From Swiss-Prot, chain A:
Residues holding NAD(+): 86-91
Entry keyword set: Cytoplasm, DNA-binding, NAD, Repressor, Transcription, Transcription regulation
The organism of origin for this protein: Streptococcus agalactiae serotype III (strain NEM316)
Chief site of localization: cytoplasm
Keyword Cell wall biogenesis/degradation: no
Coiled coil: none
Pfam families referenced in this protein's UniProt entry, alphabetically: CoA_binding, Put_DNA-bind_N
InterPro entries xref list: CoA-bd (IPR003781), NAD(P)-bd_dom_sf (IPR036291), Rex_DNA-bd_C_dom (IPR009718), Tscrpt_rep_Rex (IPR022876), WH-like_DNA-bd_sf (IPR036388), WH_DNA-bd_sf (IPR036390)
Source taxonomy: Bacteria, Bacillati, Bacillota, Bacilli, Lactobacillales
HAMAP family: Rex
Protein name listed in UniProt: Redox-sensing transcriptional repressor Rex
Protein's cellular compartments: Cytoplasm
GO molecular-function terms, A-Z: DNA binding; DNA-binding transcription factor activity
Amino acid sequence: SIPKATAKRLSLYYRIFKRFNTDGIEKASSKQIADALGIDSATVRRDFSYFGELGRRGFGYDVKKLMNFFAEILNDHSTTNVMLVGCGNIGRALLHYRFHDRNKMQISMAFDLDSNDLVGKTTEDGIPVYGISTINDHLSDIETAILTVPSTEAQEVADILVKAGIKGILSFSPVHLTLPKDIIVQYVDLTSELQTLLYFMNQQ
Amino acid sequence: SIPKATAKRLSLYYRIFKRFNTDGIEKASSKQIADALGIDSATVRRDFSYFGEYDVKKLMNFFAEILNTTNVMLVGCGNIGRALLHYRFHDRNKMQISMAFDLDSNDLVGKTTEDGIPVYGISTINDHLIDSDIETAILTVPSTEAQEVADILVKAGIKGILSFSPVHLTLPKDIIVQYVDLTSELQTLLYFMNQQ
Ligand SMILES: NC(=O)c1ccc[n+]([C@@H]2O[C@H](COP(=O)([O-])OP(=O)(O)OC[C@H]3O[C@@H](n4cnc5c(N)ncnc54)[C@H](O)[C@@H]3O)[C@@H](O)[C@H]2O)c1
């Protein structure tokens, strides 16, 4: 039963193991993993204690097998249909992207405000685009949403989606949402990421 | 003297105290904050030890103070890249993309975006940098090119890279790299939903 903070690191560990794997490294020390990741080697070690037999020795981690252990935790769900809400910019890009088959996830419908051009039309990639008005009637097994609408619509729209039965939200809107307890929300705030980057550069 | 892990959370606290200060809220709890971010209520308390002091207007100033004239370079004008060239980063815009780069052979090179962002050929990055305040790069090239282009950025004197490729960049220890990896961000959402 992995701890939350450990789980947030899964995809970081996948990334670093992939690259070791690409470079021909069979075996890695927790020190090497820490140094590449820029975290405390003792954190690598408490994390890896949760990753079964492959991680239970503080050293000589098998790079091929753990790379795969990580990919397979992160793909351990059935095929998930996802809706996109906000076919603006950053949404325009996600709207066209087709996730690798292994990921067992796809954007199967898109939404924008009814004055938008794309409503009614359909993408050359295959995805129909409906008005945020048609949201409630247009649900289905979809539980998961990507949200890319402007700061000022964010909360309003998430509330529509939550009321419509959405349990998970990947939000790009740079505003903090307040939603029922049981609703999962994961944020990618671009401005906050640049601010963090810029703060570490300014530590010199 | 902030620890690395408290520092990662700084810009997350700023966005919450902005939100309280619009709702008109005067003070907030280690409780309220931990809830908002889905981190231990404790872990907040210990972060906040390093802030000397919870009044919202004051702390929203402390985080604005600590986080705040920044021009950014964008490298790789494809799907994502062209999306970010139209993306606004700030209210009173403290953060901007001033120029962009793609392969010299790309149709977009030698053009200026509708918002006045010039686009140059990657071969010229040294010229355009030996004069500029630019220390920061957003990297939006195919995964297969990300390392190699990151090596060119660092050579040209870039100190920070926000990368959108899901590929680990091995760069000198002084370079700060931050990842926005959209596929794995969605998998991570998926992971938490299937736990809860
Ligand atoms: N499109 C999405 O919704 C999305 C989703 C998940 C991951 N990503 C990742 O983000 C990255 C960007 O993705 P994308 O789909 O926009 O890529 P893309 O192929 O559409 O665009 C890449 C751009 O890089 C330019 N380029 C190639 N080599 C260069 C170099 N040497 N110097 C300067 N420019 C160069 C190309 O001409 C092109 O304009 C990729 O790693 C991709 O896997 C994107």
